[PDB]
RNA sequence: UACCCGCAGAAGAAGCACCGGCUAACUCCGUGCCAGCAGCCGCGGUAAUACGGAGGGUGCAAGCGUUAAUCGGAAUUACUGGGCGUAAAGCGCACGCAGGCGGUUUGUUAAGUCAGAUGUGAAAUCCCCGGGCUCAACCUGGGAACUGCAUCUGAUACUGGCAAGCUUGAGUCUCGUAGAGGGGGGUAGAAUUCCAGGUGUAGCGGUGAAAUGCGUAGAGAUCUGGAGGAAUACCGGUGGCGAAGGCGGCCCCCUGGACGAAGACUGACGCUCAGGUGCGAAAGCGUGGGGAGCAAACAGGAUUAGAUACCCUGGUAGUCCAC
RNA sequence: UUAGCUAGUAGGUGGGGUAACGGCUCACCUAGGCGACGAUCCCUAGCUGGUCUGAGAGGAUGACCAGCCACACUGGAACUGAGACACGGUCCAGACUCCUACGGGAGGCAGCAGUGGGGAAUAUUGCACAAUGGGCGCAAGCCUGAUGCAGCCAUGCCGCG
């Protein structure tokens, strides 16, 4: 009670019982939330009041009263958790991965399907590239050229080498960015090489396994670019929520497969067991690599196994 | 084991009274005769006989109403683990004076009704309820 | 339960 | 001074808490899970007797509420008067000292107990009948109470001690019967794997499906022969034995308890157990052996979003023996 | 979640000692004493007649009244005297404050009130020897913050308007 000025400010982070709210000038001021708030995410502009200082100059918290409308939203469902938004109000996401512990391609494909339902442009960025040889580097560069023909920009960097950071920053200013990826793919180290942030905490960095990666850093912490825009860190995520829509939207989740629709035999097509699929003819021609097509029906067969029990929002 | 033989005597009475037995037998002693003869003189049982001199065997004749237990319940009060003694004016009654309390004194085994004219106290044996 | 047990140690009042 | 006479006129002299239930009393408006309320239960987001106010009432009273503290309720540390198969709780089991307890008959001691009496338990407080201050509170007369302790005289049924016993308790002998009871030393035959030889050819192996792995140096399969290791099919069953964990090829040796029959014999020699004492599944630890099979960690292949687990091919510690 | 404790310690002789017995004290002699029925160590506490609660058994506590023990700024010691190791007696040391001419001395409200301070919180810097009890004296008489009273504090009980 005894609240202050209603104003607009940016929420830094989410902590359940309370939240960190940046004001209109750069003041870290933690506040709790209103009971009728259905959800509050990282980087959401809100209406809030900074309480009242009990001691003169020493206040504890304020409150966050109301939540503005969403520009974007990142809704990913989960078994026995429901549909939960992670972050919101963003224009660009940067898919960040590393060659260690693994570099999969199925982790790439379903963020592409999600961003086709959010009108966001994801960017493929690889880390830890200084550890390989040029024979190995040319193969990984060859596997990303397929991801270059489909229109997505690919910038391949290294944190301990500071390669390619300057072309990574020129396309990244003026926007907010999620550094999405799995556990231990170099998310925290690339935040250190771009920002120049306060080096006295500077992150929590524990990723040591036998052949795996660890998710030590929590959900999302907000900072600022030296030029403009905001950053959003991501959890180490190994989940895939495809409970949203019909498999017609799975066909829309891929860029180059748009221009090849309406060319097959029948008006409806499963594209795997149906005779005369023109999408399958494009893969056999070589204009589409067969790694994407075998992973394409793996997405559809994953909907034969996730759907089984039931889930609805 | 058989360390309280009076409590063993009360066990054999209470079982056969409830289980419709006509007559019961038990190992005799001097003190068991001095209790059953009092219960014979107080209308709770019928008769007792002695059998054997090298193994004294006491017998009790049961008593019923229409096949109903005359001795409804009986309660051992003092015991070898805890001795109970009262004076001539602290003698407890059973069912406010309906039941009798077997108290052995120097003038033999008698009731608290019989201890009024005797004016003595001692060891409480059982609450004949 | 046994009276002779309470000779060694009485009932511990909380 | 109390007391008392006389004066004037209701004149100088009533409030607080509660009102959903517990727990005595019901309607209305305002507010809108916000504010607040609250000892418990839990009330209030569009009709709240529960919030705020009003109306009216209830319970008390020159006091009324609240907070803190003690006991009661609470049989909720259960002597009166609780439980321990699954609600919290029977030590993993056994031996046994101290301690507690003890069959039956007689005598003795009167120890415990009981009867009587003396002395004592200061007064005040409490209780009984009174008296007094106008009443009550309060003060006070005597009695009772103070269930206590010490001593003397008694009674001997029970408990204790002594004495003599008795045999049903508990033990001892003989004749017997059953048993995977333990320890030690040999020994048998399948099966597993390794190795030697023979005949013999393209897959063996493994799974839901495959792959890792093995094999033309001839695997696998079969047969002969040998080596090592550990376990004992069938019998075999709410079957037996052991204090318990447990214990299983056969045979010998040493050794333990259990049970039955016929009598003879000692005469309560008994029950129980805090500390103490020993046994006590498997894992693991120390030293030195041993090594088939199985198999933490780990190697490798599938699975997968990832596989760390599952599945599969291998594989060390350990499983084996002594200490 | 304290199991061993203890050498004047346990006992004996003799000497000494106080009003009286006694390791109360001293030399010598013995090696015992205490203790799982709690020795010893640590913490806490004045105790009892009682009050309160409870049908009772039990339970919690010890203000006012009365009995006893201990204590009188801290520590130690002795004198005086029938009786003290002495609340308003002394001596020494330490602590604190006061007086001072700088060398020294003075003081003990846990007596009645009363101030400062602590704490949620507890009073007038009153009157009197009229009565009772005590002290001294042959008595008269004197003294008594004991006590008898008064005021403050709805602090409790009881009674009335
Ligand atoms: N050699 C090398 N190491 C790198 C490079 N980038 C990052 N690392 C190392 O990779 C590790 C993982 O980095 P980190 O950013 O903590 O990973 P993360 O993805 O943030 N982990 P989390 O999922 O917990 O948030 C760190 O030890 C970091 O030093 C690189 O370019 N080269
Ligand atoms: Mg990180
Ligand atoms: Mg009512
Ligand atoms: Mg109210
Ligand atoms: Mg309303
Ligand atoms: Mg009144
Ligand atoms: Mg309380
Ligand atoms: Mg109780
Ligand atoms: Mg119970
Ligand atoms: Mg249980
Ligand atoms: Mg058992
Ligand atoms: Mg008295
Ligand atoms: Mg009197
Ligand atoms: Mg009286
Ligand atoms: Mg009267
Ligand atoms: Mg074999
Ligand atoms: Mg004989
Ligand atoms: Mg080891
Ligand atoms: Mg395995
Ligand atoms: Mg070993
Ligand atoms: Mg002497
Ligand atoms: Mg006084
Ligand atoms: Mg006193
Ligand atoms: Mg003194
Ligand atoms: Mg002194
Ligand atoms: Mg003084
Ligand atoms: Mg005073
Ligand atoms: Mg103060
Ligand atoms: Zn098609």
List of residues 6+ apart from A198 with CB closer than 8 A: none
Same domain, B24 and B40: yes
Rounded Cα distance between A258 and A150, Å, is 11
Return the number of other C-beta atoms located less than 10 Å from residue C3's C-beta: 9
Closest CA to B79 of B29, B30, B8: B8
| C-alpha dist (Å) from residue A216 to A17, A19, A187 | 21, 20, 11
Same domain, B49 and B25: yes
Return the number of other C-beta atoms located less than 10 Å from residue A100's C-beta: 15
List of residues 6+ apart from B111 with CB closer than 8 A: B38, B42, B100, B101, B102, B103
Rounded Cα distance between B9 and B39, Å, is 13
Contact A112, A122 (CB under 8 A): yes
Same domain, B59 and B100: no
**Angle of the A106-116 helix axis to the A290-302 helix axis, nearest 10:** 70
Q: Which helix (H) or strand (E) holds A241?
A: none
Residues in chain A: 313
List of residues 6+ apart from B118 with CB closer than 8 A: B105, B107, B110
Same domain, B31 and B64: yes
Same domain, B1 and B64: yes
Rounded Cα distance between B101 and B77, Å, is 10
Rounded Cα distance between A186 and A215, Å, is 11
Rounded Cα distance between A131 and A16, Å, is 40
Rounded Cα distance between A164 and A170, Å, is 11
Same domain, B79 and B65: no
Query: In the numeric block, which tokens belong to residue A242?
Result: 């495809």
3-class state of residue A47 by DSSP: strand
Contact A140, A132 (CB under 8 A): yes
Q: Is the Cα torsion angle A14, A15, A21, A26 positive or negative in sign?
A: negative
Question: 């929520």: which residue's tokens?
Answer: A241
Quick one: closest CA in C to B81, which residue?
Answer: C4
Query: In the numeric block, which tokens belong to residue A164?
Result: 């390619």
Q: What are the chain B neighbours of C2 within 8 Å (beta carbons)?
A: 81
Of B71, B88, B107, the position where a domain reaches its end is B71
Looking at residue B114, which CATH number applies to its domain? 3.30.1490.10
Same domain, B23 and B45: yes
Assign 3-state DSSP to chain B and report helix, strand, coil percentages, each to 5: 25, 30, 45
From the centroid of its chain, how far is CA A135?
30
Domain of B109, in residue numbers: 72-129
Rounded Cα distance between A222 and A234, Å, is 11
Closest CA to A303 of A259, A245, A222, A252: A245
Ligand 14 centroid to residue B90 C-alpha, Å: 29
Give me the long-range contacts of A257-265 (CB less than 8 A, separation at least 24): A257/A288
The torsion angles phi and psi of A24, rounded to 5 degrees, stand at -80, 10
Contact A4, A62 (CB under 8 A): yes
Same domain, B84 and B64: no
The torsion angles phi and psi of B48, rounded to 5 degrees, stand at -140, 140
Of B33, B49, B71, the position where a domain reaches its end is B71
Same domain, B4 and B22: yes
The torsion angles phi and psi of A233, rounded to 5 degrees, stand at -80, 160
Query: In the numeric block, which tokens belong to residue A264?
Result: 């097959």
Rounded Cα distance between A53 and A56, Å, is 6
Q: Is the CB of A2 under 7 A from strand D?
A: no
3-class state of residue A299 by DSSP: helix
Q: Which helix (H) or strand (E) holds A256?
A: none
Q: Is it true that the peptide bond before B42 is cis, omega within 30 degrees of 0?
A: no
From the centroid of its chain, how far is CA C1?
8
Rounded Cα distance between B74 and B76, Å, is 7
3-class state of residue A303 by DSSP: coil
From the centroid of its chain, how far is CA A237?
10
DSSP A186: S
Q: Which helix (H) or strand (E) holds B61?
A: strand B57-61
Closest CA of chain C from B6, distance in Å: 20
Rounded Cα distance between A87 and A105, Å, is 24
Query: In the numeric block, which tokens belong to residue A26?
Result: 């750069």
DSSP codes, A142-184: HHHHHHHHTT--EEE-BTTTTBSHHHHHHTTTTS-EEEE--TT
Same domain, B63 and B110: no
Rounded Cα distance between A205 and A187, Å, is 10
Contact A61, A32 (CB under 8 A): yes
From the centroid of its chain, how far is CA C2?
8
Which atom of ligand 1 is the closest one to the Cα of A191? 15
Question: 């409806």: which residue's tokens?
Answer: A268
Pure H helices in chain A: 106-116, 134-149, 165-170, 187-195, 248-251, 278-285, 290-302
Rounded Cα distance between A26 and A49, Å, is 16
Return the number of other C-beta atoms located less than 10 Å from residue A67's C-beta: 21
Looking at residue B10, which CATH number applies to its domain? 3.30.1370.30
- Report, in angstroms and rounded to the nearest whole number, the Rg of chain C calculated over CA atoms: 7
Closest CA to A101 of A239, A212, A179, A236: A212
Return the number of other C-beta atoms located less than 10 Å from residue B90's C-beta: 8
Strand D: which positions are within 7 A of a protein CB? 33-36, 45, 77-79, 82-84, 90, 100-106, 112-116, 154-159, 166-169, 270-271, 298-299, 305-308
Q: Is the Cα torsion angle A275, A279, A282, A283 positive or negative in sign?
A: negative
Q: Is the Cα torsion angle A67, A69, A72, A78 positive or negative in sign?
A: positive
Of B71, B86, B105, the position where a domain reaches its end is B71
* Pairing, β B57-61 against β B23-27: antiparallel
- Give me the number of domains chain B comprises: 2
Q: Is the Cα torsion angle A231, A233, A238, A243 positive or negative in sign?
A: negative
Same domain, B87 and B124: yes
Query: In the numeric block, which tokens belong to residue A101?
Result: 């512990």
Residue A186 beta carbon below 6 angstroms from any ligand 1 atom: yes
A57 conformational bin, left if phi > 0, alpha if psi -120 to 50, beta if neither: left
Same domain, B9 and B64: yes
Nearest 5°: CA angle at B96, between B92 and B100?
60
């Amino acid at each position: 009670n005894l609240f202050g000025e209603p104003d607009e400010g940016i929420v830094i982070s989410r902590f359940g019982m309370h939240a960190d709210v940046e004001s209109a000038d750069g003041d870290v001021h933690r506040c709790n939330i209103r009971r009728t708030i259905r959800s509050l995410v990282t980087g959401d502009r809100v209406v809030w009041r900074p309480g009242k200082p009990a001691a003169e100059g020493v206040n504890v918290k304020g409150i966050v009263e109301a939540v503005h409308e969403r520009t974007s939203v990142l809704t990913r469902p989960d078994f026995y958790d429901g549909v939960k938004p992670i972050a919101a109000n963003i224009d660009q996401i940067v898919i960040v991965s590393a060659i260690l512990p693994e570099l999969s391609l199925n982790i790439i494909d379903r963020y592409l399907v999600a961003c086709e339902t959010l009108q966001i442009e994801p960017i493929i960025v690889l880390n830890k590239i200084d550890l390989l040889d040029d024979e190995g580097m040319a193969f990984v560069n060859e596997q990303m050229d397929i991801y270059r023909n489909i229109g997505y920009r690919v910038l391949m960097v290294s944190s301990h080498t500071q390669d390619g950071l300057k072309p990574l920053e020129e396309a990244l200013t003026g926007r907010i960015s999620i550094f999405a990826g799995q556990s231990g793919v170099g998310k925290s180290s690339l935040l250190n090489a771009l920002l120049g942030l306060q080096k006295e905490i500077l992150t929590n960095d524990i990723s040591d396994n036998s052949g795996l990666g660890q998710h030590t850093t929590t959900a999302a912490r907000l900072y600022h670019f030296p030029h403009g825009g905001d950053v959003i860190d991501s959890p180490g995520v190994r989940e895939f929520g495809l409970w949203h829509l019909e498999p017609e939207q799975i066909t829309q989740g891929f860029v180059e497969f748009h221009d090849y629709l309406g060319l097959c035999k029948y008006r409806d097509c499963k594209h795997d067991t149906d005779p005369g699929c023109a999408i399958r003819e494009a893969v056999e021609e070589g204009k589409i690599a067969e790694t994407r097509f075998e992973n394409y029906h793996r997405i559809l067969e994953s909907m034969a196994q996730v759907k089984t029990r039931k889930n609805f929002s | 084991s058989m360390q309280d033989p009076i409590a063993d005597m009360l066990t054999r009475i209470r079982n056969g009274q409830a289980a419709n037995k006509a007559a019961v037998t038990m190992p005799s002693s001097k003190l068991k005769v001095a209790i059953a003869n009092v219960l014979k003189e107080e209308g709770f049982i019928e008769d007792f006989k002695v059998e054997g001199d090298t193994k004294p065997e006491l017998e009790l004749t049961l008593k019923y109403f229409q096949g109903k237990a005359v001795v409804e319940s009986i309660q051992r009060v003092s015991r070898p683990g805890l001795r109970i003694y009262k004076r001539k004016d602290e003698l407890p009654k059973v069912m406010a004076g309906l039941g009798i309390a077997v108290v052995s004194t120097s003038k033999g085994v008698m009731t608290d009704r019989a201890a009024r004219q005797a004016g003595l106290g001692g060891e409480i044996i059982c609450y004949v309820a | 339960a046994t009276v002779n047990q309470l000779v060694r140690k009485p009932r511990a009042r909380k």
